[PDB]
Amino acid sequence: GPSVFLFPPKPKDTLMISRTPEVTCVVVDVSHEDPEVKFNWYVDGVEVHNAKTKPREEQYNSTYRVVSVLTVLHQDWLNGKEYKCKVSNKALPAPIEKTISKAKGQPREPQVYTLPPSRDELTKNQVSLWCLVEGFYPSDIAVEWESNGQPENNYKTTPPVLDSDGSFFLYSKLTVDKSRWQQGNVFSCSVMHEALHNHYTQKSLSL
Amino acid sequence: GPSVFLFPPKPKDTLMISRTPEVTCVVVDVSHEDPEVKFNWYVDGVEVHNAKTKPREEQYNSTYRVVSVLTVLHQDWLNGKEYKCKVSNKALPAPIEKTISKAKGQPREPQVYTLPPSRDKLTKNQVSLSCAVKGFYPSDIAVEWESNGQPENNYKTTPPVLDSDGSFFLVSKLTVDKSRWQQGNVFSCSVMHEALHNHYTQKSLSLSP
Ligand SMILES: *[C@@H]1O[C@H](CO[C@@H]2O[C@@H](C)[C@@H](O)[C@@H](O)[C@@H]2O)[C@@H](O[C@@H]2O[C@H](CO)[C@@H](O[C@@H]3O[C@H](CO[C@H]4O[C@H](CO)[C@@H](O)[C@H](O)[C@@H]4O[C@@H]4O[C@H](CO)[C@@H](O[C@@H]5O[C@H](CO)[C@H](O)[C@H](O)[C@H]5O)[C@H](O)[C@H]4NC(C)=O)[C@@H](O)[C@H](O[C@H]4O[C@H](CO)[C@@H](O)[C@H](O)[C@@H]4O)[C@@H]3O)[C@H](O)[C@H]2NC(C)=O)[C@H](O)[C@H]1NC(C)=O
Ligand SMILES: *[C@@H]1O[C@H](CO[C@@H]2O[C@@H](C)[C@@H](O)[C@@H](O)[C@@H]2O)[C@@H](O[C@@H]2O[C@H](CO)[C@@H](O[C@@H]3O[C@H](CO[C@H]4O[C@H](CO)[C@@H](O)[C@H](O)[C@@H]4O[C@@H]4O[C@H](CO)[C@@H](O[C@@H]5O[C@H](CO)[C@H](O)[C@H](O)[C@H]5O)[C@H](O)[C@H]4NC(C)=O)[C@@H](O)[C@H](O[C@H]4O[C@H](CO)[C@@H](O)[C@H](O)[C@@H]4O)[C@@H]3O)[C@H](O)[C@H]2NC(C)=O)[C@H](O)[C@H]1NC(C)=O
């Protein structure tokens, strides 16, 4: 029978009020013999009716893939409400039920520190700027770099690491031309997390 | 029927001549009816005879577990030789073969940088010292901290992260009581990797007035 996978919104979508967070229910292996899928959606066990189900679409293993998308309210997600997808198909013994919610646990505020390049490194032609983010919980987070209001996207960020106190830390490494650094340009690490005021902080770094 | 799991040596063990790297071939779900198990070991397809095999040990699920350990030459592992464990048992249709070797790819030398605490952290009680290791390949690496001739307990290291140029980086975070940092104590990040001279390099950090 078919399989169902339920996916959360993007952290940045739940944290920025301008954005629209979505929960996504994906049904795979819908065979031709029975192509019809019914989605029932529930928030905290109360059924809701505003999900939008997409035109089911045929895959190369020649079976079907069906997707329903439910817009969530930012504060519902952040307040820990549970989102249940129920998938009904002729070919199932019983309907499939998947439930998802925000990672549980007492929130803890990220501490954000920018670290300049090592001396050592001032001899190649690029330098590494570092954004250390530590002490946060849960691990859902968004970390971005910019300069003069523009995204600097030539960076890589480690996954969150569980630290000895049960909080998480990570490191974002931004690589820039050494000339940009030596000439005094200002670079900024932006962090978005539920435990921050306005879900947002920015820390800047320059020579 | 029985199942076989073949485990590699730890990276540090292959990089330090004083340590003993081993490949471990583990057989589980050996029956009471057919308890005999034979190991044959091959290095690049050439049979070798010096493995040390343990007596079978019964588990709480009434099956046996049997382990054979092959000591490997550091340089054989680092030169990419293939280690094959072949397991024979009368309950099996044919012997089970498993093969393992070091991760492949052109080695690249890690660059190691220590990063002092942010000033923002100095009013916190504990400060975080950073050891950034970048540009290395393959991802097998060991990173350790010490001070004053003893290891430091209180550090965590990120997994290797694939960078935009195809190499890996990571960072190691050592948390210390702020007094010890202000004290002037020297802390040292040691990195062990196949592409380092002597498979080892160390960088140190202490408060700069
Ligand atoms: C027939 O084919 C289909 C499809 O095959 C694929 O497509 C074809 C064309 C070829 O390219 C194939 O090579 C492909 O495989 C097969 O369907 C697959 O079935 C698998 C099960 O057998 C299933 O495995 C499970 O995957 C989960 C993760 O899936 C993620 O991530 C992968 C990437 O690694 C990706 O392929 C999936 O699409 C899915 O991606 C996420 O999608 C969601 C939904 O859109 C995204 O979230 C939304 O995104 C939007 C913006 O896009 C917005 O942000 C919304 O707000 C947000 O909600 C999300 O961003 C995507 N993430 C990523 C990373 O891409 C696993 O988690 C799961 O693990 C389970 O088991 C684990 C241990 O085993 C457990 O620990 C764990 O808890 C889980 O329980 C499974 O491994 C594949 O996902 C599925 N592929 C697709 C495309 O649906 C089908 O099986 C095959 N049939 C046969 C008979 O072979
Ligand atoms: C009957 O019982 C046996 C025994 O189990 C015990 O007794 C039972 C009754 C219960 O009480 C259990 O709770 C007990 O543990 C069962 O045997 C198990 O069978 C499993 C398969 O069915 C098998 O699963 C596979 O596990 C692999 C990981 O094994 C690691 O890690 C686990 C911990 O997570 C650990 O328990 C294992 O012992 C093994 O530990 C590693 O050992 C190696 C070798 O010693 C270590 O490497 C050496 O270390 C030294 C120094 O320490 C030196 O560095 C050497 O250089 C080096 O070689 C290594 O450090 C250890 N690692 C860790 C983390 O400790 C998985 O990889 C594997 O996954 C793969 O295959 C899967 C499919 O099976 C895939 O899904 C997957 O993707 C992978 O491809 C399996 O999950 C168990 O290991 C095995 N347990 C033991 C103890 O052998 C038996 O199943 C059961 N039968 C029945 C019918 O019920």
Numbering used by the authors:
A (entry chain A): 237 to 443
B (entry chain B): 237 to 445
From the paper:
In this work, we describe Format Chain Exchange (FORCE) as a high-throughput technology that enables efficient combinatorial generation of bispecific antibodies in different configurations for “screening in final format”. Educt molecules are knob-into-hole heterodimers of one half-antibody-like productive side and one knob or hole dummy Fc. The dummy associates with the knob or hole Fc of the productive side (covalently linked by hinge interchain disulfides) and thereby covers the CH3 interface.
The implemented changes include reverting in CH3 Cys354 and Cys349 (KiH interchain disulfide) back to the parent residues Ser354 and Tyr 349 on dummy knob and dummy hole, respectively. Additional mutations introduced into the CH3 interface are charge-flip mutations between Glu and Lys at position 357 and 370 of the knob or hole dummies. These residues constitute an interchain salt bridge in regular CH3. Limited reduction of hinge disulfides initiates an exchange reaction between complementary educts driven by their partially destabilized interfaces. The reaction resolves the flawed CH3-educt interfaces to perfect complementarity in the products of the exchange reaction. Those products are bsAbs with regular CH3–CH3 interface-disulfide stabilized knob-into-hole Fc’s and dummy-dimers, each with non-repulsing interfaces. Raw samples of the exchange reaction contain not only the desired bsAb product, but also dummy-dimers as byproducts and potentially some remaining educts or aggregates. The C-terminal His6 affinity tag on dummy chains enables to apply a single robust absorption step to remove all undesired proteins from the completed reaction (concept in Fig. 1a and data in Fig. 3b).
